[PDB]
Amino acid sequence: AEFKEAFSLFDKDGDGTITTKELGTVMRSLGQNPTEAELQDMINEVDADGNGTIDFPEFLTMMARKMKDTDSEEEIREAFRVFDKDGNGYISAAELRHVMTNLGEKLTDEEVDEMIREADIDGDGQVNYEEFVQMMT
Ligand SMILES: [Sr+2]
Ligand SMILES: [Sr+2]
Ligand SMILES: [Sr+2]
Ligand SMILES: [Sr+2]
């Protein structure tokens, strides 16, 4: 019911489809001002049957995947903040060790250091959000 209300904001003229122009109108109302070329890409990504507009079932299918990706992100972020005790955006070896103790795993500095290295792509001796997401895969 809520996705259909979202759809109707896009379908300006009520014909059951969203054209590039109708999507531009909306994006502009949201503070974005994409080119026609950018608008056509956005339509094309959602337009499963290629006829050149987005219809409600196409919209709904995308929105449901966006919902599922959004929820997943929200959850990985929650877990990250659990580890980043002081919330500065990096998990430190001390934070990881502390938190693993509460997860029931009494680890040494060597063992927590080896875990941080596995994930430490950028080599600063800690784990940022990207790096964390990468390990959760
Ligand atoms: Sr329309
Ligand atoms: Sr279509
Ligand atoms: Sr931290
Ligand atoms: Sr790092």
From Swiss-Prot:
UniProtKB keywords: Acetylation, Calcium, Cell projection, Cilium, Cytoplasm, Cytoskeleton, Disease variant, Flagellum, Host-virus interaction, Isopeptide bond, Long QT syndrome, Metal-binding, Methylation, Phosphoprotein, Repeat, Ubl conjugation
Residue positions binding Ca(2+) 2: D47, D49, N51, T53, E58
Protein name, entry field: Calmodulin-1
Compartmental location: Cytoplasm, Cytoskeleton, Spindle; Cytoplasm, Cytoskeleton, Spindle pole; Cytoplasm, Cytoskeleton, Microtubule organizing center, Centrosome; Cell projection, Cilium, Flagellum
Modification Phosphotyrosine occurs at: Y90, Y129
Binding site for Ca(2+) 1: D11, D13, D15, T17, E22
Cross-link named Glycyl lysine isopeptide (Lys-Gly) (interchain with G-Cter in SUMO2), sites: K12
Modified residues (N6-acetyllysine): K12, K85
One cellular component term from this protein's GO annotations in UniProt: protein-containing complex
This protein's record includes keyword Zinc: no
Gene3D superfamilies tied to this protein: EF-hand
Residue positions, PTM N6,N6,N6-trimethyllysine: K106
Modified residues (Phosphoserine): S72, S92
